[PDB]
Design a protein around this ligand. Structure first.
Ligand SMILES: Nc1ncnc2c1ncn2[C@@H]1O[C@H](CSCC[C@H](N)C(=O)O)[C@@H](O)[C@H]1O
Lengths: 265, 265
């Protein structure tokens, strides 16, 4: 009678930790959700084969609205697992589900997995230098989210990097590309004119982290906004003040313009 | 011709990903470094038995200085694995190793694993709300670092949470406890008088992240400074402004005082 939150990792079924796999193999029921992120290198069938269990996929509504009516009842009499892409508690609201579990008298444990939040280290940007993070959300009809613009501005004033999670509408198979994110940001810039995100802004794009051959690119918006970074998922980063070692890596590994090596002090 | 940077994860030998383990098992040579961080819940022997390959441990100098003299020459003609605690490249110096590999004409790939940066999500605090991060280091001789104090100040001023890594005597396997960190912070507060860290400051302690039985506690410094949080490692977090779900999680899961529920959003 327990509930395991288990992360599946960044890209494919092998991104789960050994700990996660062995525990999942011992569970009576295995649930999962694939709406918080996209695992571009695998399929539900491959994950099921690896774990050797049939997986019950839940929709956002199943979870947010009925987690305690679908999953918790079973966890009271069986060992249950709830799988999620990346790390289960990063850039999701699944942490709140641990409260529902507790109040239902169900013990829960968390098994971590690689997350895009730390995988950004592969960009060469100092991870301790990132400030507040935000999500570039899809406009919805007349509704046009812009709060993430203010996040970049706040971090930039402090010389900190900004990690921009890109939106995803799994049920509509909508996965925001770094290009779309840049386009939206430029539109927000035209509205706010804060001089935060322009054609001359240096950005970093990381696509399909977790794969052996992810796309890591750095350059000015005007040059990357029309570049093909490959299939999603994508994350966008707006660096703050670059240190020489960060610039060196972006140039050597991400093909950034050599001119960024000449940092401004 | 290939060099694999493989992360070992948070706590023990099972924290490596399936992908990382399977790749390591296929390598001709396997190196490991335990000077940037440590695997508190395991030993070199257990990691070695899990992979089934002999593992050669490298010192700080072996890597920082002679990486190209020890590892790269072998990577030129063989498949080589370089194991590191946590997630590869989260450690700042590791990024340049990829450049050295490139310079030496050796291909390198990164196999991610869980890192504290993403694992702190288990504290129930929103990952988006974390600001700049810092490390609390042992004062030694005529060196008493205090910059981490200013990081907290700047983050808190913006309502952001502050992730504080605690110092470690890598070679000696000696860890700074959350208790010692609180002591130091209270001392820095005395010589800073910024009202940033006091007996009434709410803090969160995360012990042994990655283990199946981590300790997660939250409360005011005055009440937690002398509490036993169990074996290391310990991570300290100074929350900024909480929203109600973060507060509820801390109360329900971390045993925080009900007082914190009067959030200030
Ligand atoms: N492997 C990956 N590569 C690049 N971006 C990724 C990624 N994983 C997810 N993302 C980005 O982040 C969004 C999901 S946010 C939730 C992520 C997950 N909990 C984790 O720990 O990784 C996606 O819409 C995408 O923009």
């Amino acid at each position: 009678m327990v509930l395991y939150f288990i992360g599946l990792g960044l890209y494919d079924e092998r991104d789960i930790t050994v700990k996660g796999l062995e525990i999942a193999k011992k569970c009576d029921y295995v649930f999962a959700e694939f709406y918080t992120s996209l695992m571009a290198g695998t399929t539900l069938g491959r994950i099921q084969k690896l774990i050797g269990k049939e997986i019950r996929v839940l929709s956002r509504e199943d979870v947010e609205l009925n987690f305690e009516n679908i999953v918790l009842p079973l966890a009271k009499e069986n060992d249950v697992a709830f799988l999620t892409p990346g790390d289960p508690l990063v850039a999701t609201t699944h942490a709140e589900l641990r409260i529902r579990a507790k109040r239902a008298g169900v013990e829960s444990y968390v098994i971590h997995a690689p997350s895009i939040y730390s995988a950004v280290g592969i960009t060469g940007l100092h991870i301790y230098k990132f400030g507040k993070s935000a999500t570039v959300a899809y406009p919805e009809g007349n509704w046009f989210p812009t709060s993430y613009y203010d996040v970049i501005k706040e971090n930039a004033e402090r010389g900190l990097h900004t990690l921009l999670f890109l939106d995803i509408k799994a049920e509509k198979r909508m996965y925001m590309t770094a290009n779309e994110a840049m386009e939206l940001l430029l539109k927000v810039e035209d509205m706010k004119k804060g001089g935060v995100f322009t054609d001359d802004t240096l950005v970093v794009v990381l696509a399909r982290a977790g794969s052996l051959n992810p796309t890591i690119r750095a350059g000015y918006v005007k040059d990357l906004i029309r570049e093909d970074f490959g299939d999603p998922p994508h994350i966008l980063i707006v660096p703050g003040k670059l240190m020489i070692v960060e610039a060196e890596y972006l140039v050597e590994i991400a093909g950034a313009p050599r001119e960024i090596l000449r940092v401004n002090v």
